[PDB]
């Protein structure tokens, strides 16, 4: 019942295998064919500093697909400049064969092995139309992207009485005759010039220049939309005036990073499509010159690269959408746009939206918000020009649950990904996204999230958030769809939700009444610690009433700086385990996974396995980033030869009590000192010996409490510190002044080859007193629960938890159960019994 994984990595930075996988049942009809490039290409390793990059040849691929193993009876064939193919027809049931070829410059075909896949009677069908169908009916008039000319007068009439629409005209009006200076006079480079490390210097320059470009983009976009809503040409004149100034910044030594360049493409698209029928010859040539120039640059970056990266953050967040809209703005007018529409349309269908198909966001809490406009505007646009519902992708209904569970109403986010610590309460962008899901998917949980939050805070959509990647005001001005009626309440959600492919879990005692909610979050993820994710496999965080207590420490000062690598991404910042003080590898190789779980009512359960996540850093991407950044992946900083053989963490939610039981199995290749970590981020912990173990009291500055009752199969010593491994220096000046210190508890065992830990965590606020832990009859009882477990380094692990009066039980053992976890639960008066075994993700 217990699976051992022996892969060096579960997910690849650069695609290494074909999809659909050999011998699999496909998840959708038609399958989405993808394969590794003939010349696999990592590409530039940072935004400001590319590092060592290889050639990226242009290539041609072919593909053949058939139920005839010898590829003569009824064969689907295609040729592409890129390693993905969409058949654009549902395939017949049965077994299928296929292969792909690389075609050399000389015309020779290099054919792959012949792969197999199967289609069932049950296989779901999601079959968007060919691009040829879409372009055939696509109108030649403008506007056609920001809105359609045939609907223009209707959109104007509808918004005459839309108070949200007034903001465009008010913001745009303040720009008129209010000149914009050149970039060198507007930018602040005073911090930039103090930085000697080139990764830091260029990253600071990107931030400082984006401040100005993003400010003025908001002005230009308001001018375009104000013109569209009023047809007052004063907005056209100032729109062209301002955009012309920004475009002249193009070749400035201060115009840094790819978002700034994509912003020029975006604004040129908006002005070209929206002002089209007013443009002078010179104005039209200016916009078209820059669409041609910058669209070609981005297409050339993407092709033979983007489609096979695990995920390419800036592209997924913003620049892909910007290329797509520039392409459809100009298709049939400039020849380059035919290739771009082909690429963008097929790449979206091939593998977007999202990476994890369970709906969770791979890069964590803050990164999700930078994707909001891409996740809605691209399928809204594709759907209206196609007549086909691109929101039928099941990812969206899945992601609706991620939106709610990862950050409940008025609550701190679950604590994953870069800048997690700043995500303190759902912002207007998140509510605007949930609103779009409610309308486009008729999703009642998304609708309940919007309505229950807007009842407490009716002005939430106008509160502060970064508007550039997330503001859906224009979607709300243009959609014909209404908010669905409030039906479901958030209180009708299951207490717990597990994202098996994302590798996360959220447990809640009262998700529908946030101020009373005791919450625990957990991560053990096949994505590992690359990109914006952290090295926090098998880490948990706790919350009460929407404010954290036990919580991942450190500050997001950058992407690769020493504080990030040693004290924020690093495993030592998290509520997990170190091995002789050493932590998890940085990259996809530092992966975890969730082998088994159970979402119930009187009891829920999740397990994380991080057995392979420790050791030396070997990721080529992160070794190159480290070389450029000054990182030392050495034992002194926390990475050494792997000693870890087995690390499973069992997390049991004890119904709605606010109690959680965390039980750890650990095995090493030799005797090692195990370090058990807890952190808080507002107040120090208070530690006393309690029976044969330790009591660790964490509290926040509000009502929140979390008490760890920690026991181990070996003797422990402990210490607490107020300082990070290395100072949280805000060299970028990207954070507020203060940057409080955090607090770090470490329990270290005597050296041993095996150890077990039991941690009973009591999470509450002013709703009740501390729970009393009774040590009786050689087990432990609290509030009617009875907890037995193995705390013998020489004996077999087991965990038995039962509440006889609630009718709940959990039994994990290697004897009766052969490694399985058996569950008994009560749901709607009915006895539920489950036997849980491992499954891969
Ligand atoms: O609290 C927040 O910080 C925050 C909350 C919001 O939800 C979110 O919208 C906002 O995102 C912005 C960041 O705050 C901002 N940080 S800043 O310091 O630059 O002002 C920035 O973050 C980007 C950056 O491009 C970069 O930031 S940082 O250097 O880590 O400080 C970094 O980008 C990586 C990138 O992820 C990598 N992609 S890859 O796929 O892994 O290869 C690759 O491109 O390298 C760069 C770093 O290169 S370099 O070192 O700079 O040369 O992280 C990005 C990010 O976190 O999104 O921009 C975001 C979004 O801008 S917004 O305001 O329009 O939303 O964050
Ligand atoms: Ca992202
Ligand atoms: Ca993370």
Numbering used by the authors: 24 to 864
Article excerpt on this structure:
Herein, a type of exolytic heparinases (exoHepases) is identified from the genomes of different bacteria.
Furthermore, a crystal of an inactive BIexoHep-Y390A/H555A mutant with an unsaturated HP tetrasaccharide substrate was obtained, and the structure was solved at a resolution of 1.73 Å by molecular replacement with Phaser using the complex structure of BIexoHep with the product as a template. In the crystal structures, each asymmetric unit consists of one BIexoHep monomer, an unsaturated disaccharide (ΔUA2S1-4GlcNS6S) or tetrasaccharide (ΔUA1-4GlcNS6S1-4IdoA2S1-4GlcNS6S), and two Ca2+ ions that were confirmed by inductively coupled plasma-mass spectrometry (ICP-MS) analysis. Notably, the BIexoHep complex with the disaccharide product and the structure with the tetrasaccharide substrate do not show significant differences (the root-mean-square deviation (r.m.s.d.) between the two structures was 0.140 Å based on 786 atoms). According to the hydrogen-bonding networks, a series of residues, such as Asp70, Ser226, Arg230, Arg233, Arg332, Asn336, His337, Gln340, Tyr390, Ser554, His555, Arg579, Arg648, Lys755, and Arg757, participate in the binding of the disaccharide product (ΔUA2S1-4GlcNS6S) and the tetrasaccharide substrate (ΔUA1-4GlcNS6S1-4IdoA2S1-4GlcNS6S). In contrast, the nonreducing end sugar rings at subsites −1 and −2 have fewer direct interactions with the residue sidechains because the “+” subsites are deeply buried in the tunnel, while the “−” subsites are exposed to the environment. The residues His337, Tyr390 and His555 match well with three key residues His202, Tyr257 and His406 in the active center of Hepase II from P. heprinus DSM 2366, indicating that they may also play key roles in the catalytic mechanism of BIexoHep.
